[PDB]
Each structure stands twice: as C-alpha cells, then as structure tokens.
Design a protein around this ligand. Structure first.
Ligand SMILES: Cc1ccsc1C1=NO[C@@]2(CCCN(Cc3c(F)cccc3F)C2=O)C1
Ligand SMILES: Cc1ccsc1C1=NO[C@@]2(CCCN(Cc3c(F)cccc3F)C2=O)C1
Lengths: 271, 267
C-alpha cells in the first residue's frame, strides 16, 4: 500500500510524500534535512525494488568485498514544499566516467506537476577491508547497468552545472564557525554509521543567524573525504565567496583532518 | 492523498504511516524518536481537522493569553514496526480532573489490526506571560470538550497504570550521564522552541551502551518542569531502580528540565 513504484520501463522509481508538521522549519516549509532524508528514502526503495542490498551492493560486489561510497551530493531547491503538500520524487542511476556511478532525483509538487527541486550524487566503489578506491571490470558494471537508462538522463542537463563546480578548501580563519560538534546516537543509521543528513545540519550550523533570518538555501554541494566516527569531535567552518554563497569545511577538532567540504547558495526571502 | 481523517462521530482521528528507511535504527525497526514524531503529527492533524491552531489553542485561550503545555508524556511500544510496515494511529483528547486534559494514542499494525503501542499525555493551561498554571471556567473548556468523548475512553484503562506512577528524583551521582549537551538549530521547531523528541534522544544518551546493545525500550515516561532554551547547556543523568530513572538538569544552575522512567526488554 506504499504509493512507491518502479516506472513502466523499470529504469526509474517514483515515490510521493505528504510533508509533515515536524518536517518544516522557521519558513513554514520542509527543512533541507527533510529533503535529503526523502532523496535517500526513494534511493533505498529503488535499490530494494531491483534486488540490491544499507550499501546497495550487487552479487559480485559482495564477492569482491566492495561497497558504494558517496564522493559528492548536490541538492538544488527552487521551492520548499509546505506542511500538507504532496511531493513526488523520481530517481534513477547512470554510469559516471571510469570510476563513478550517479544517482539523480527530480522533485515535483504532486498537485501542479511543476519541478521544485533536483539532486545528483557521485558514488565510487571502495574495498570495505582496505578502504581503497577499486576500479571494477565491465561484468560488475553490467550487474547494475541493466537497471539504468541506456541513453543519458541528466537532472542537470545544462552545460557547466554548479553540480560539477570544484569546491576549494576555505582559508583559515573562517568568518564563521560552530566548534566541538559531536554525533548523537540518533545520528547513527541501521548500520551504526553517521548519516549524511548529520553533515547538512553541521554545515548549516556554520551559517550566521542573520542569513538564516533573511534567506533560504537554493543549493548545497558536499564533497565527502572521511566518515565521522561515533566519538569524533568536529568543527564546522564557513566563509562567503539578493544572493550570497558560502564555502564550508568540516574538520576533526584534534588533528584538523578534512571530514568534508561544501558550498551553499542562498536567495533573499522578500516575504 | 493523506489517509488521515476524523472518525464518523468526529470524536477521534486516525492516520496511517509507511515506516521509512531513515526512520529505523540499529535494531532494524522505527526509533522511539520516529514514534514520538508520528504521535505529534497525528495530534497536529487532529487539531487542524476541528479548527484549532502550532499551539492547538482555542479562541478564548488566545484571548486569556493561555497555551497548552505537556506535564507528562507516556509511550509503551510492544513491537517496533520495520521499514515498509503501515501503522495506523488513533488519537483523541479527554478532560483530566479539574486542571488537566489528556491526549491518548493507540498504534496498530495496519495489516493485522494488532495493537503494537499506546501513549497518553497530560496537558495543563499556562499563562504565556507568567508561566503559571491557570484554571479556566466551564465555557472555555466547552470550546475543546465538544471534540472529546464525554464518557471515559482510556488507552491505559488498567487499574494501577505505569502511565500514572510518580517519578522520584534520582540521587547524585548517577550510574550513567551525558554532560554538556546543547540543542542544535535542527532541534528547534517552526516557533524556535526545542522539540519534545530532543528530550527523548537526550534521555537515551544516558543509557549505558551495554543496555542499548542487548535491550530495546518498552516504556518512557517524562515529567516536564522547564523548556530547554536554544543556548542552554544540559546534563542527562540515569540510574537503575530493567528500569532506569532519568533527570535532565541545567549545567549552570542544576535546575530540573524534566525527569523520566524507561523500561527495557531483552532482544
Ligand atoms: C541513495 C542511497 C542511499 C544509500 S546507498 C544509495 C545509492 N544511491 O545510488 C547508488 C549508487 C549506484 C548503485 N546503486 C544501485 C542501483 C543502480 F545502479 C541502478 C538502479 C537502481 C539501483 F539501486 C545505487 O542505488 C547508491
Ligand atoms: C497537538 C498539539 C500541538 C500543540 S499543543 C498540542 C496538543 N495535543 O493534545 C492537546 C491537549 C488537549 C487540547 N487539545 C485540543 C483538542 C481537543 F481538546 C480535542 C480534539 C482535538 C484537539 F486538537 C490538544 O490537542 C494539546
């Protein structure tokens, strides 16, 4: 009784959500964290519907002790849905160069069929024993390429997409910082790993209150380098680079080692 | 396409939820926080369906500068639903003595119609300016009592309900504690207030890892005393009385935020 299903061609997956009272923030609309969680939810349901499995592995991936890891996540929201709004999310995967796979999403207001947001993500294979990036042969690829559109389908079809823009390391000292952030138990998933959405909240903690009060987020790009461990302590840094952009850097308090880096783009709210 | 509606008599409200991948924890089942959020969600939809309003106020409440505040929240989960499980939640309110109103919930597996959980909560009216409990006359009450069963409907009908057992103050030092906890921006709601579910996470942070690894939560009772403010620093304490007593206190002053009881069953 899910209202979540493969499309007729079996190469993309759609799921609808009614935005809940507790999912909205100050703007009376769905938080970035809610959106990120819905993108993940539809990914997982898609994975289950075509027979993968927490890590979206194939038979041969489990055989070679390989797992998918996020290199990049990019979310663009044109309009945050309010409480009671039904949103429909379509998601699909595609081959990305010689090391990567993409997952893309399109977010539509279910009522109007208008696109209100889009996301894309770059995934690489890692040997779970050695933590090394591992290229795989064509038959490993064929196991998931079956379930991808044959001709390029891009959520970001434009020429020089912000989705692909490199993120530099911001220069210390940062204009803005939230220091000594620690995972809570509620920030661990079903496999005892720190959830991506934890990193979106920590990025957003670095934004000055003045920006949060007068602007909402249009884009977030994260490049992941390391997993935060359950007893790690983290600093969220930001600097600027009716519009503003911020660079972001998450680093370990002790060692200064990069957890991830980010870019946010904001638009002034006039009402 | 809500699947969320007043019952025929208009005196209770039912809503169904499909449990999502991100809503389950280590035990491969919906977290306490997910459950708490669904109970709140069905409360808010109920409030909107009979014309209240974020604060579930009536006309005369807004006039007397009164708001609802939770005195007690009690949740019993007999079975945590897995990812893909449809759960149905019925909720209703009832007059509770001379000062109090109750909201009750019953949680059913939609497929079997089996009760897998139940919750009850005690609410008082408070003057938002003075933070004092304020009794009101019968006509103020009648504004919300219209929308309640007149005769006893109890989620906890049993004689000496755990839901009504007093919570004593645990003795320092606590067996278990998480110190210097701070609300995140993401722990504030639409009105810049710390969400109840933040308190459930903080209660759970005080539970020894050994208990989390071998048991799941069957009951949680919280008595609320104060709101945590956005830049407050909080200590979450626990000791066994398996059952645990809980105490949330301000790091600075030592003042009680709330106190609690959890009951655990072996996995
Ligand atoms: C969104 C999400 C959450 C946990 S893992 C994950 C993933 N999103 O994209 C990934 C990488 C690429 C491999 N797959 C498997 C896959 C196909 F390749 C094609 C069609 C469906 C499908 F599940 C992913 O899902 C991982
Ligand atoms: C749902 C909500 C949001 C902010 S406070 C609150 C509450 N949930 O339970 C309470 C207690 C009793 C008063 N009401 C109003 C009410 C009826 F009295 C009867 C039927 C529906 C209804 F919304 C509550 O909802 C407070």
């Amino acid at each position: 009784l899910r209202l979540g299903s493969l499309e007729p061609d079996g190469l993309s997956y759609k799921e609808s959500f009614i935005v809940r009272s507790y999912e909205v923030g100050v703007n009376k609309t769905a938080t970035v964290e809610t959106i990120a969680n819905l993108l993940q939810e539809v990914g997982c349901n898609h994975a289950q519907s075509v027979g993968f499995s927490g890590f979206a592995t194939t038979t041969t991936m489990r055989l070679l002790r390989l797992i998918w890891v996020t290199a990049r996540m990019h979310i663009e929201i044109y309009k945050y849905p309010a409480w009671g709004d039904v949103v429909e999310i379509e998601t699909w995967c595609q081959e990305d160069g010689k090391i990567g796979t993409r997952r893309d999403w399109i977010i539509k207001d279910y009522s109007t069929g208008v696109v209100i947001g889009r996301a894309t993500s770059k995934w690489v294979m890692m040997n779970q024993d050695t933590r090394r990036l591992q290229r795989v042969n064509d038959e490993v690829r064929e196991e998931y390429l079956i379930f991808c559109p044959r001709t390029p389908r891009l959520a970001f079809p434009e020429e020089d997409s912000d989705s692909l823009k490199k993120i530099p390391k911001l220069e210390e000292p940062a204009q803005s910082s939230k220091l000594g952030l620690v995972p809570r138990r509620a920030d661990l998933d079903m496999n005892q790993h720190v959830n991506n959405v934890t990193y979106i909240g920590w990025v957003l903690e670095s934004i000055p209150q003045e920006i949060i009060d007068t602007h909402e987020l249009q884009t977030i790009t994260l490049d992941y380098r390391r997993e935060c461990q359950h007893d790690d302590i983290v600093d969220s840094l930001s600097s600027r680079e009716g519009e503003c952009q911020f660079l972001h850097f998450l680093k370990l308090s002790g060692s200064g080692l990069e957890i991830n880096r980010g870019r946010t783009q904001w638009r002034r709210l006039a009402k």
